[PDB]
Scaffold this active site. Structure first.
Site, PDB file in Angstrom:
ATOM      1  N   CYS A 173       0.796  -1.360  -0.085  1.00 53.43           N
ATOM      2  CA  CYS A 173      -0.134   0.201  -0.050  1.00 53.43           C
ATOM      3  C   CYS A 173       0.744   1.212  -0.058  1.00 53.43           C
ATOM      4  O   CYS A 173       1.644   1.316   0.947  1.00 53.43           O
ATOM      5  CB  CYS A 173      -1.138   0.049   1.270  1.00 53.43           C
ATOM      6  SG  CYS A 173      -1.668   1.451   1.327  1.00 53.43           S
ATOM      7  N   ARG A 209       0.116   4.566   2.770  1.00 55.08           N
ATOM      8  CA  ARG A 209       0.145   4.106   4.086  1.00 55.08           C
ATOM      9  C   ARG A 209       0.807   5.557   5.026  1.00 55.08           C
ATOM     10  O   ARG A 209       0.970   5.294   6.188  1.00 55.08           O
ATOM     11  CB  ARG A 209       1.229   3.163   4.698  1.00 55.08           C
ATOM     12  CG  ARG A 209       0.593   1.777   4.310  1.00 55.08           C
ATOM     13  CD  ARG A 209       1.652   0.544   4.580  1.00 55.08           C
ATOM     14  NE  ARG A 209       2.398   0.534   3.637  1.00 55.08           N
ATOM     15  CZ  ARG A 209       3.797  -0.097   3.640  1.00 55.08           C
ATOM     16  NH1 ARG A 209       3.995  -0.531   4.896  1.00 55.08           N
ATOM     17  NH2 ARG A 209       4.557  -0.081   2.659  1.00 55.08           N
ATOM     18  N   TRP A 263      -8.921   6.711  -0.437  1.00 50.86           N
ATOM     19  CA  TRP A 263      -9.338   7.622  -1.629  1.00 50.86           C
ATOM     20  C   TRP A 263      -8.214   7.059  -2.863  1.00 50.86           C
ATOM     21  O   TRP A 263      -7.166   6.567  -2.595  1.00 50.86           O
ATOM     22  CB  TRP A 263      -9.135   9.187  -1.626  1.00 50.86           C
ATOM     23  CG  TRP A 263      -7.670   9.608  -0.954  1.00 50.86           C
ATOM     24  CD1 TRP A 263      -6.691   9.718  -1.637  1.00 50.86           C
ATOM     25  CD2 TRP A 263      -7.550   9.807   0.290  1.00 50.86           C
ATOM     26  NE1 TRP A 263      -5.700  10.086  -0.819  1.00 50.86           N
ATOM     27  CE2 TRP A 263      -6.283  10.232   0.600  1.00 50.86           C
ATOM     28  CE3 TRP A 263      -8.312  10.001   1.516  1.00 50.86           C
ATOM     29  CZ2 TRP A 263      -5.808  10.566   1.634  1.00 50.86           C
ATOM     30  CZ3 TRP A 263      -8.151  10.363   2.706  1.00 50.86           C
ATOM     31  CH2 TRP A 263      -6.602  10.800   2.928  1.00 50.86           C
ATOM     32  N   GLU A 266      -4.712   4.149 -10.623  1.00 48.47           N
ATOM     33  CA  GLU A 266      -5.788   3.156 -10.464  1.00 48.47           C
ATOM     34  C   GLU A 266      -6.820   3.010 -11.352  1.00 48.47           C
ATOM     35  O   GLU A 266      -7.356   2.084 -11.818  1.00 48.47           O
ATOM     36  CB  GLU A 266      -6.239   3.041  -8.953  1.00 48.47           C
ATOM     37  CG  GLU A 266      -5.284   3.059  -7.854  1.00 48.47           C
ATOM     38  CD  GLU A 266      -5.611   2.794  -6.403  1.00 48.47           C
ATOM     39  OE1 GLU A 266      -5.991   1.713  -6.219  1.00 48.47           O
ATOM     40  OE2 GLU A 266      -5.407   3.895  -5.617  1.00 48.47           O
TER      41      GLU A 266
HETATM   42  C1  HEM Z   1      -6.234   6.822   1.941  1.00 46.26           C
HETATM   43  C2  HEM Z   1      -5.824   6.674   0.313  1.00 46.26           C
HETATM   44  C3  HEM Z   1      -5.076   5.301  -0.160  1.00 46.26           C
HETATM   45  C4  HEM Z   1      -4.387   5.222  -1.359  1.00 46.26           C
HETATM   46  C5  HEM Z   1      -4.162   6.388  -2.108  1.00 46.26           C
HETATM   47  C6  HEM Z   1      -3.820   3.817  -1.242  1.00 46.26           C
HETATM   48  C7  HEM Z   1      -3.368   3.433  -2.597  1.00 46.26           C
HETATM   49  C8  HEM Z   1      -3.021   2.079  -2.666  1.00 46.26           C
HETATM   50  C9  HEM Z   1      -2.889   1.337  -3.972  1.00 46.26           C
HETATM   51  C10 HEM Z   1      -2.418   2.346  -5.444  1.00 46.26           C
HETATM   52  C11 HEM Z   1      -2.625   0.065  -3.804  1.00 46.26           C
HETATM   53  C12 HEM Z   1      -2.307  -0.844  -5.004  1.00 46.26           C
HETATM   54  C13 HEM Z   1      -3.260  -1.618  -5.458  1.00 46.26           C
HETATM   55  C14 HEM Z   1      -3.490  -1.437  -6.963  1.00 46.26           C
HETATM   56  O1  HEM Z   1      -2.798  -0.686  -7.549  1.00 46.26           O
HETATM   57  O2  HEM Z   1      -3.980  -2.549  -7.613  1.00 46.26           O
HETATM   58  C15 HEM Z   1      -2.818  -0.071  -2.447  1.00 46.26           C
HETATM   59  C16 HEM Z   1      -2.896  -1.537  -1.887  1.00 46.26           C
HETATM   60  C17 HEM Z   1      -3.588  -1.750  -0.504  1.00 46.26           C
HETATM   61  N1  HEM Z   1      -3.767  -0.638   0.193  1.00 46.26           N
HETATM   62 FE1  HEM Z   1      -3.814   1.302   0.126  1.00 46.26          FE
HETATM   63  N2  HEM Z   1      -4.647   3.196  -0.344  1.00 46.26           N
HETATM   64  C18 HEM Z   1      -5.307   3.790   0.600  1.00 46.26           C
HETATM   65  C19 HEM Z   1      -5.782   3.632   1.724  1.00 46.26           C
HETATM   66  C20 HEM Z   1      -6.034   2.203   2.122  1.00 46.26           C
HETATM   67  C21 HEM Z   1      -6.751   1.916   3.596  1.00 46.26           C
HETATM   68  C22 HEM Z   1      -7.571   3.027   4.406  1.00 46.26           C
HETATM   69  C23 HEM Z   1      -6.271   0.701   3.656  1.00 46.26           C
HETATM   70  C24 HEM Z   1      -7.040  -0.330   4.740  1.00 46.26           C
HETATM   71  C25 HEM Z   1      -7.339   0.244   6.110  1.00 46.26           C
HETATM   72  C26 HEM Z   1      -5.504   0.330   2.684  1.00 46.26           C
HETATM   73  C27 HEM Z   1      -4.985  -1.041   2.542  1.00 46.26           C
HETATM   74  C28 HEM Z   1      -4.439  -1.290   1.478  1.00 46.26           C
HETATM   75  C29 HEM Z   1      -4.014  -2.781   1.258  1.00 46.26           C
HETATM   76  C30 HEM Z   1      -4.230  -3.963   2.228  1.00 46.26           C
HETATM   77  C31 HEM Z   1      -3.284  -2.996  -0.020  1.00 46.26           C
HETATM   78  C32 HEM Z   1      -2.780  -4.025  -0.668  1.00 46.26           C
HETATM   79  C33 HEM Z   1      -3.704  -5.445  -0.699  1.00 46.26           C
HETATM   80  C34 HEM Z   1      -2.566  -6.760  -0.900  1.00 46.26           C
HETATM   81  O3  HEM Z   1      -1.810  -6.901  -0.044  1.00 46.26           O
HETATM   82  O4  HEM Z   1      -2.812  -7.512  -2.031  1.00 46.26           O
HETATM   83  N3  HEM Z   1      -5.396   1.421   1.773  1.00 46.26           N
HETATM   84  N4  HEM Z   1      -3.272   0.950  -1.652  1.00 46.26           N
HETATM   85  C1  OU7 Z   2      -8.448   1.357   0.692  1.00 38.34           C
HETATM   86  C2  OU7 Z   2      -7.715   1.434  -0.964  1.00 38.34           C
HETATM   87  C3  OU7 Z   2      -7.594   2.516  -1.652  1.00 38.34           C
HETATM   88  C4  OU7 Z   2      -6.860   2.700  -2.782  1.00 38.34           C
HETATM   89  N1  OU7 Z   2      -7.062   3.824  -3.687  1.00 38.34           N
HETATM   90  N2  OU7 Z   2      -6.690   1.513  -3.590  1.00 38.34           N
HETATM   91  C5  OU7 Z   2      -6.635   0.355  -2.700  1.00 38.34           C
HETATM   92  C6  OU7 Z   2      -6.320  -0.831  -3.412  1.00 38.34           C
HETATM   93  C7  OU7 Z   2      -6.507  -2.095  -2.790  1.00 38.34           C
HETATM   94  C8  OU7 Z   2      -6.129  -3.324  -3.578  1.00 38.34           C
HETATM   95  C9  OU7 Z   2      -5.358  -4.291  -3.038  1.00 38.34           C
HETATM   96  C10 OU7 Z   2      -5.052  -5.268  -3.883  1.00 38.34           C
HETATM   97  C11 OU7 Z   2      -5.451  -5.641  -5.060  1.00 38.34           C
HETATM   98  O1  OU7 Z   2      -5.450  -6.413  -5.996  1.00 38.34           O
HETATM   99  C12 OU7 Z   2      -5.524  -7.919  -5.580  1.00 38.34           C
HETATM  100  C13 OU7 Z   2      -5.484  -8.898  -6.468  1.00 38.34           C
HETATM  101  C14 OU7 Z   2      -6.017  -8.862  -7.628  1.00 38.34           C
HETATM  102  N3  OU7 Z   2      -5.800 -10.241  -8.374  1.00 38.34           N
HETATM  103  C15 OU7 Z   2      -5.487 -11.236  -7.695  1.00 38.34           C
HETATM  104  S1  OU7 Z   2      -4.818 -10.567  -6.341  1.00 38.34           S
HETATM  105  C16 OU7 Z   2      -6.492  -4.560  -5.748  1.00 38.34           C
HETATM  106  C17 OU7 Z   2      -7.058  -4.568  -7.177  1.00 38.34           C
HETATM  107  N4  OU7 Z   2      -8.394  -4.060  -7.011  1.00 38.34           N
HETATM  108  C18 OU7 Z   2      -6.641  -3.317  -4.742  1.00 38.34           C
HETATM  109  C19 OU7 Z   2      -7.036  -2.256  -1.739  1.00 38.34           C
HETATM  110  C20 OU7 Z   2      -7.383  -0.992  -0.920  1.00 38.34           C
HETATM  111  C21 OU7 Z   2      -7.357   0.177  -1.500  1.00 38.34           C
END
Ligand code: HEM
Ligand code: OU7
Ligand code: HEM
Ligand code: OU7
Ligand code: H4B
Ligand code: H4B
Ligand code: ZN
Lengths: 411, 411
Positions: free
Chosen positions: B108, B111, B280, B285
């Site tokens: 993430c 963070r 947000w 994304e």
């Molecule tokens: C506040 C603005 C936030 C932004 C801009 C953000 C941004 C991102 C982005 C771009 C990813 C990669 C996902 C992708 O591109 O497919 C990600 C992953 C993730 N975000 Fe954040 N996030 C935010 C808030 C949060 C919050 C509030 C939580 C949980 C309380 C969270 C939990 C996670 C988790 C768990 C992952 C990765 C999941 C995994 O391990 O596969 N995010 N985040």
């Molecule tokens: C809170 C919050 C805000 C944000 N701005 N972004 C997020 C993106 C994520 C996330 C985490 C893993 C993902 O992908 C897992 C897998 C896909 N295929 C096999 S595992 C995706 C894809 N939607 C999103 C989770 C939370 C987010």
């Protein structure tokens, strides 16, 4: 433990068994992944060297479908005897070529490996001097350049003996532009090469002090002090950089060299260590336009381009950097293609590499691949390698990093 | 035993001791890196040590380690475990656990915000209707008329794995996708399978290109039930471009609130199988992945055509050029409507500041380079040149298999 890799864009699933033939270590553990560390990691004893040779010769004689044959066991015993006496051994020309081609095939960070078996291997193991090194390198440069129709090549100098007689090319690439510090603050030329550009002057090089000053060669033979040599300018193919839509692009006064020839790595084959082994292919466009021109610690011309494009550089959210980065990379490909100099765009090379992965899983059972390095430094997810799971492991023969000589050299 | 990472653009080196507190496994070994692999029923036997670890962490954070309040709580959890085979977190512990699961989420990039998480305790929830009401309130609070606010809603924990609460949607708000008989897809291709389940469960599909999906909610192991989020709660943003008037005519829109709902929250050995969380969007994304992935809306061609690019050869970088414009339009549309969004430049810069701060005050920051680096313009963001160490800390968010593959149907 017969591992699988999924392509998430196509659901193609490949099964990897090659990794079980892996020898060296990745730097990772079960508790920590070091997959984004740039560099993990004084001669082989008589004992560690023979198993290395056996493993190499075993895989050599298998490749020519002669495992467990007359010639195999004979050569095995022959090398065994040479190690027993000489404490080292020499590769037959055939083994040298195979070893070199497979060091590239096993280069998990290289996106160009679909071309791996079309490598021109130049045996320079009879070289004794820096002048001789310079000769072999001019011939390499000319052969590889081929008037813009580039051809992959490696030139292999004598192997290390006792770490005191090392052949080394002190340049990081055969062709690189100089970098000079300015009295006021900025950097003229290429900031990546500032320390090497100093060691050259600090060794006797008379610097023209321009932007695109081709650096001299600093060649070290048999462990003596290195010597400066000037690559004949007619051997250095260079591309003037212009844009197919923007006529003001010429006015930037940019050019780049056509031949990427990396010269500071170590080639390991059957335990033998070739400390001087410059190898060359041709550029992927982003290697120049994204990294060489737009990295902050490099040419860093992004601001100047976006200004000339009259873009709103007041907030990052206008994506003016991204907009300029694209145009710069459009120009590089336009310029090389216009001058008939070989170059590949990042979409073509990554598509080729997925096909190469296909072949390697099909005919070899796997392909070691370092996602962090295979994905291009722009437009990552619209290229096919972004959605390709990859497994990274260290196979041998290999290219390895090695210290910079000046930190080591008993000057 | 300490570990260093280097930012190669700034030569800043940082020292990680936090990885020693790591428990779970990464999937890597000494001989293989699984760094690019997408994804590499609990008894009293192994539950109290997990509880004790969490409680040791928790009381350390409040500077009460070894206090009577700490030892009493340990004993209280113990008796509750041997007696009831599970245990209940206090509200303070739940809030701490949720915030640290986010702080520990190594993929993430957002963070920096981890400590400003609004935690909604829904552990008194008993039915799908109650789940619908809790989620509605989450969505309204989180959306805040465009001034987005991070939040999570935590439903009752797993007990015997036969009474799970699940949100069957992958995100609270997502657009339907419909496979047509001619092979084409109307709507979001990423959601065809979930859309079909919904339709099979009785959802009347408008069969439009941007239909908000219904909530499919499962309480206490019962069959899931359908609910429609009130349309006034779903904030959407029409996508237009600041220079290209024709961009609006593509009819694109996106929703404002990213709220992921298919992951599992683990805290002290307890498993919260339904725990939707939201923040947000980072612009890429939507504009890189949601719109331009070949297996998503895949509007790259339409945008390239309307721009009148050279779409014949990929080396014209028409794909790269349209991707930037689309991401420009996404940011412009959100900012113009005052809906919280962050560009990939701002977000990666923040993350580097966050990461350095975490190395200072925590001894480390687990980070997954493969996921942190944005999917466009990677090397011109500062995380590209940042070495990162990836390891698993708890509390954590984990993947879990889609419930329709494991669920036992009541009828
Ligand atoms: C506040 C603005 C936030 C932004 C801009 C953000 C941004 C991102 C982005 C771009 C990813 C990669 C996902 C992708 O591109 O497919 C990600 C992953 C993730 N975000 Fe954040 N996030 C935010 C808030 C949060 C919050 C509030 C939580 C949980 C309380 C969270 C939990 C996670 C988790 C768990 C992952 C990765 C999941 C995994 O391990 O596969 N995010 N985040
Ligand atoms: C809170 C919050 C805000 C944000 N701005 N972004 C997020 C993106 C994520 C996330 C985490 C893993 C993902 O992908 C897992 C897998 C896909 N295929 C096999 S595992 C995706 C894809 N939607 C999103 C989770 C939370 C987010
Ligand atoms: C023919 C066209 C070739 C292309 C387009 C190509 C492409 C690339 C690219 C883009 C990288 C990443 C480096 C960076 O981002 O700075 C790389 C790395 C590398 N290439 Fe290739 N390459 C080619 C030929 C070759 C040849 C002929 C060799 C050796 C015989 C080779 C060996 C390597 C090695 C050893 C690395 C780095 C591996 C490491 O650091 O562990 N390449 N290549
Ligand atoms: C033959 C050929 C063709 C090409 N088209 N490209 C190449 C790039 C490479 C390479 C290998 C390691 C690097 O690593 C940088 C480091 C410096 N110090 C510690 S790592 C870099 C960066 N130029 C490039 C090597 C060979 C290439
Ligand atoms: C195979 C590869 O790991 C996979 O495509 C990952 C790569 N990195 C990613 N990074 C982000 N932020 N989001 C993603 O979905 C992915 N997908
Ligand atoms: C920190 C990071 O590992 C470092 O910047 C690497 C990342 N990926 C790379 N990938 C390529 N192709 N070339 C590089 O120089 C780098 N640099
Ligand atoms: Zn790893």
């Amino acid at each position: 433990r017969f591992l699988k890799v999924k392509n998430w864009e196509t659901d193609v699933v490949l099964t990897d068994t090659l990794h079980l033939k892996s020898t060296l270590e990745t730097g990772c553990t079960e508790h920590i992944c070091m997959g984004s560390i740039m560099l993990p990691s004084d001669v082989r004893t008589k004992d560690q060297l023979f198993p290395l040779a056996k493993e190499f010769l075993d895989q050599y004689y298998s490749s020519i479908k002669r495992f467990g044959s007359k010639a195999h066991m004979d050569r095995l015993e022959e090398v065994n005897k040479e190690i027993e006496s000489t404490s080292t051994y020499q590769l037959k020309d055939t083994e040298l070529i195979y070893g070199a081609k497979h060091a590239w095939r096993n280069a998990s960070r290289c996106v160009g490996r679909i071309q791996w078996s079309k490598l021109q291997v130049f045996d320079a193991r009879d070289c004794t001097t820096a002048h001789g090194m310079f000769n072999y390198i001019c011939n390499h440069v000319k052969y590889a350049t081929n008037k813009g129709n580039l051809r992959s090549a490696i030139t292999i100098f004598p192997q290390r003996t006792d770490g005191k007689h090392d052949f080394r090319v002190w340049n990081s690439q055969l062709i690189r532009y100089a970098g000079y510090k300015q009295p006021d603050g900025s950097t003229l030329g290429d900031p990546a090469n500032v320390q090497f550009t100093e060691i050259c002057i600090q060794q006797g090089w008379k610097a023209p002090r321009g932007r695109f000053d081709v650096l001299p060669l600093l060649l070290q033979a048999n462990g003596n002090d290195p010597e400066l040599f000037q690559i004949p300018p007619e051997l250095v193919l260079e591309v003037p950089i212009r844009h197919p839509k923007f006529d003001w692009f010429k006015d930037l006064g940019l050019k780049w060299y056509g031949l990427p020839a990396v010269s500071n790595m170590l080639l390991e084959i059957g335990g033998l260590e070739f400390s001087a082994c410059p190898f060359s292919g041709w550029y992927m466009g982003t290697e120049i336009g994204v990294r060489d021109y737009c990295d902050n610690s490099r040419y860093n011309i992004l601001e100047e381009v976006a200004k000339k494009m009259d873009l709103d550089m007041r907030k990052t959210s206008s994506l003016w950097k991204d907009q300029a980065l694209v145009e710069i990379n459009i120009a590089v490909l336009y310029s090389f293609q216009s001058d008939k100099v070989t170059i590949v765009d990042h979409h073509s090379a990554t598509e080729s590499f997925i096909k190469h992965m296909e072949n390697e899983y099909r005919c070899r059972g796997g392909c070691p691949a370092d996602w962090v390095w295979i994905v291009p430094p722009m437009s990552g997810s619209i290229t096919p390698v972004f959605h390709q799971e990859m497994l990274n492991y260290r196979l041998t023969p290999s290219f390895e990093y090695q210290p910079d000589p000046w930190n080591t050299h008993v000057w």
